[PDB]
Structure formats: C-alpha cells, structure tokens
From a paper:
[name] from Flavobacterium sp. SA-0082 is an endo-type fucoidan-degrading enzyme that cleaves the sulfated fuco-glucuronomannan (SFGM) through a lytic mechanism. We show that the [name]-NTD adopts a right-handed parallel β-helix fold, and possesses a substrate binding site composed of a long groove and a unique alkaline pocket. Our structural, biochemical, and enzymological analyses strongly suggest that [name]-NTD utilizes catalytic residues different from other β-helix polysaccharide lyases, potentially representing a novel polysaccharide lyase family. Here, we report crystal structures and enzymological characterization of wild type (WT) and eight single mutants of the catalytic N-terminal domain (NTD) of [name], revealing its unique substrate binding pocket and identifying the key catalytic residues.
We solved the crystal structure of [name]-NTD WT at 1.3 Å resolution using the single-wavelength anomalous diffraction (SAD) method. In the [name]-NTD structure, two molecules are present in an asymmetric unit and adopt nearly identical conformations, with a root-mean-squares deviation (RMSD) of 0.11 Å for all Cα atoms. [name]-NTD forms a right-handed parallel β-helix, one type of the six PL classes, shaping like a fish skeleton with a dimension of 67 Å × 22 Å × 47 Å. The [name]-NTD molecule contains 13 coils, with coils 1–6 being complete, while the other coils lacking either PB1 or PB3. The T3 loops at coils 1–9 together with the adjacent PB1 sheets form a 30-Å long concave groove at the surface of the β-helix. In contrast to other PL enzymes, which form a planar groove, [name]-NTD extends its C-terminal part of the surficial groove into a deep pocket, measuring 11 Å × 13 Å × 8 Å. The region comprising the deep pocket and the C-terminal part of the groove (between coil 5 and coil 9) is characterized by a strong positive charge, which is unfavorable for metal binding due to the electrostatic repulsion. Moreover, we observed several bulbs of non-protein densities in the ‘groove-pocket’ region, and modeled these densities as three sulfate groups (S1–S3), based on the density shape and the fact that high concentration of sulfate ammonium was added in the crystallization reagent. One sulfate S1 is located in the alkaline pocket, strongly indicating that the positively charged pocket facilitates the attraction and interaction with the negative charged sulfate groups of fucoidans, explaining the previous observation that [name] can only cleave fucoidans containing sulfated fucoses. In addition to these common stacks and ladders, we also found an unusual cysteine ladder composed of five cysteine residues (Cys168, Cys192, Cys267, Cys290, Cys309) that are located at the T2-PB3 juncture of coils 4–8, beneath the potential substrate binding groove.
Residue numbers in the entry: 1 to 443
C-alpha cells in the first residue's frame, strides 16, 4: 500500500494528492541554492506544501539538509520549508537540518501546520539562519525595531487539532522555537525544545567594536539601555501562544486567537519562555513538563499547570502575565539548578490577578539571596523596568492560595490582599498587604 520514492523530485507530486501512503527512502537529501528556480526542483515556497488530505509520509532514516541560502532565493518573501494545508495527515521521523547561518531575505518559519487533525511525529529539526543573531529581542521583535530583524522560527502550529508529538526541535536562530497562531485545540506532546543563552554583560562588552548594538549605544526597544546582570535566550519562546493569527482549513481563511492549547510531557531548555499560553483562550492545560535555564518558566494566564517543574537560574519559574489573570491553578516544582545562577529578575515567582491556587515544591536548600516569591510589587524583570510593558508589572493580587512547600522567602507587597499563605517557614515571609493569612506547615 506504500509507494516508495528515491528523490525529492519524485516525492513532490504526491503532496498534491489525497489518500496516499508514501515513503521517502532512507538516505541523505540536500537542497542547495541551485535547486531553487523556474526549471529547478523548487520553483515556489513553501518548499514542501502538503495540500492533500488523509495521507501518511514516512521519513525514517531520511536526513534532509537545507542550505540556509535558500531563505534568500525567493525575493522579499517569507520562506517556509514545510507547510501542511490538508487534513488528517501524518508526517513521521524526518531529520531536517538547516545548513549554515545565512539570514532570510525577509523571514522564515521551518514548519507551518494549517488544516485539521494533522500530526508531525518523531522529527528532529535544527533551525539556523536569522538576523540579528546574538541579542534576543532587546533591539526589537516586531515593528518599530531598533535593529531590523530577519526572524526564523521553528514550528508554527495553526489550524484545528494539530499535534506535534515526540519531536526534538533545536534552535540556533532568532525566532520562536514552537509557537501557536490561530490554532484551535493544538497539542504539543513529548517534545524536547532547546535554544541557547547569552548574558547581557557579554552583549554590553561589544562596546567600542562597531557592532549593531554598539552603534545604537545598546538602547533597547524597552526604552532604556540594556541592563547588565541578566541571561537572555537567543531564541524567542519555547512554546508560545498568540491571541491572533491566520489559518486555512478546508478552503476557509480564518483569523482568530489560539484556543484550548494542551502541552504534555515536554522539556524546554534555554528559551525566552518555557510555556507561555496567557494569550490563548479556552482551556489551557500543561502537565508533566520540565523547563530548564529559560528566562521564564510558566505563564498560562488561567487554567492548569500540574506535575511540572522549572529551575530558576535565569528567571522566575512562574509569572502571572497581567492583573487580569484569573483562575491560574499551578503545582510547580522548583528544580535543582541546571547551571550557575544568573537571575537578574530578583524573583523566583511573580504573582498577581485573582482566584489562583498555587503550590510550589522544592528540595533546594541553598536559596540565592536575591530570589523570593513575590505577591504584587515591582518586579525587576528585564523587559518591565522603568514603566516598560506596564500592564505586565506592578499589579494587585487578591484571593490567592499560596502553598509554599519550599525554603524560598515570600514578600507580600502592599497591593496584595486576601492571600492565604502556608509555608515551611514563616520567619522569612514579609507581609505588607491587607487581610493576608500566614500559617506554618511541618516540612
């Protein structure tokens, strides 16, 4: 029942057909700049456009090497390596590596999943080639940038009931690693998602070199000179949901927020955020995840984080996004450090909004002197200093259960009220709020 093909050329016609079972034979396949053109293997982007439905594609033992020069071969357009437009497809086991670090002429996204009921499983993706690479988002991630960008993101999940399962996504590119736009009921499950880090002190050491950041005197899009003392990802989000986007299902163009995301059993390392779903609507559910060395652990706005862990070396394990957050239930283990601490945010968690039920658990006994659980107050977060992003800082918290089964101190700011705190120790809790309850628990 399976048709086997032995070249990319012979693969491409099947992507236009429904109800096919296709295998690209084990081997190595190289896409270079000479493969893009009118009489060339790829005359259009997306390179691999899966238009059919009800199809299965086996890429076991396939290594697909795509030279980053290809990101410049389509004019000023966005380039996407793989897009799925049909429904009910399964793509499995591909190892896809971007070769070199050439930046897109405009921007790129490795995989885009539209349609409904598709699954990408067993992929190993290495994403490269973007600009500027080395500053994270300090000089701009959208419009009005201080340094204009050519971003390149990994997997963009859209559509309906789309599933990324058991994949390894390694990014050495400035872009999100896995992100969701206009996606209804997406699921990310069993994935390992990894970026890399650079300190702001190392960025500031470019002074006098003539680098792009040196030429703008390190003035960030946040409205202040880049501060020393933080560790940034060179990527954007590990898993990040958007409140907007465009998708296509069954010939219908759809503009909507992400809704009903589920994240299960993922490990996210060295990204700007581990799991951020606050901008999605519907039910948010996160279970069984591990977040290591990210700038932020979990921010889902409302919903459930259960049986999840994060270390706190570079940023807080938990952050309420806005004072509008309501009904965020979380059970988070503060994991042993994955490297030396370099957390300039001066917090292990920042809590606010209302009607949350939050449990933190840890075996940590060496508590860095600058780290505490904050309920309300003025977070020294890299992107929220000096009034930057004002809705994301300095907000009230009300009617919150805080079970602190850790040795970290807790600081209840004057804008906190009706906080029910239980803690292993209460000697290191400061209470400047209103009608808060503090009670000791045994271990």
């Amino acid at each position: 029942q399976t048709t086997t093909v032995y070249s990319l050329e012979d693969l491409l016609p099947y992507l236009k057909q429904d109800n096919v079972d296709v295998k690209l034979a084990p081997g190595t396949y190289n896409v270079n700049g000479f493969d893009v053109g009118e009489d060339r293997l790829f005359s259009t982007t997306p390179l691999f456009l899966f238009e059919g439905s009800n199809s299965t594609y086996d890429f076991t033992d396939v290594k697909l090497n795509i030279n980053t020069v290809v990101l410049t071969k389509f004019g000023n357009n966005e380039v996407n390596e793989i897009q799925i437009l049909g429904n009910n497809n399964v793509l499995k086991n591909l190892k896809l590596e971007d070769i070199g670090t050439t930046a897109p002429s405009n921007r790129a996204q490795s995989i885009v999943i539209d349609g409904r009921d598709n699954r990408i499983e067993g992929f190993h993706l290495t994403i490269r080639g973007s600009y500027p690479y080395g500053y994270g988002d300090a000089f701009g991630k959208g419009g009005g940038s201080v340094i204009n960008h050519r971003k390149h993101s990994g997997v963009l999940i859209r559509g309906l009931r789309n599933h990324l399962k058991d994949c390894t996504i390694i990014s050495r590119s400035y872009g999100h690693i896995v992100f969701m736009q206009a996606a209804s009921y997406p699921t990310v499950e069993g994935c390992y998602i990894e970026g890399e880090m650079r300190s702001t002190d190392d960025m500031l050491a470019e002074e006098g070199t003539g680098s792009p950041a040196d030429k703008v005197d390190f003035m960030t899009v946040w409205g202040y000179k880049l501060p020393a003392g933080y560790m940034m990802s060179l990527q954007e989000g590990g898993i990040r949901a958007y409140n907007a986007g465009t998708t296509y299902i069954d010939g219908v163009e759809i503009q909507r927020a992400t809704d009903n995301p589920t994240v299960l059993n993922c490990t996210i390392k060295n990204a700007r955020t581990g799991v951020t779903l606050a901008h999605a609507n519907g039910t948010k559910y996160v279970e069984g995840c591990t977040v290591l060395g990210c700038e932020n652990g979990y921010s889902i706005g409302s919903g459930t984080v259960v049986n999840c862990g994060a270390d706190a070396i570079y940023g807080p394990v938990f952050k309420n996004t806005y004072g509008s957050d309501k009904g965020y239930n979380a059970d988070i283990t503060i994991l042993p450090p994955s490297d030396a601490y370099y957390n300039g945010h001066d917090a292990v968690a920042y809590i606010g909004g209302s009607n949350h039920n939050l449990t933190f658990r840890s075996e940590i006994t060496e508590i860095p002197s600058n780290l505490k659980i904050m309920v309300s107050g003025d977070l020294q977060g890299l992107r929220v200093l000096h009034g930057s992003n004002p809705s994301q800082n300095n907000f009230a918290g009300t009617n919150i259960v805080l079970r602190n089964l850790t040795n970290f101190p807790v600081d209840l700011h004057s804008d906190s009220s009706n906080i029910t705190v239980t803690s292993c120790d209460t000697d290191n809790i400061t209470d400047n709020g209103t009608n808060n309850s503090i009670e000791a628990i045994d271990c």
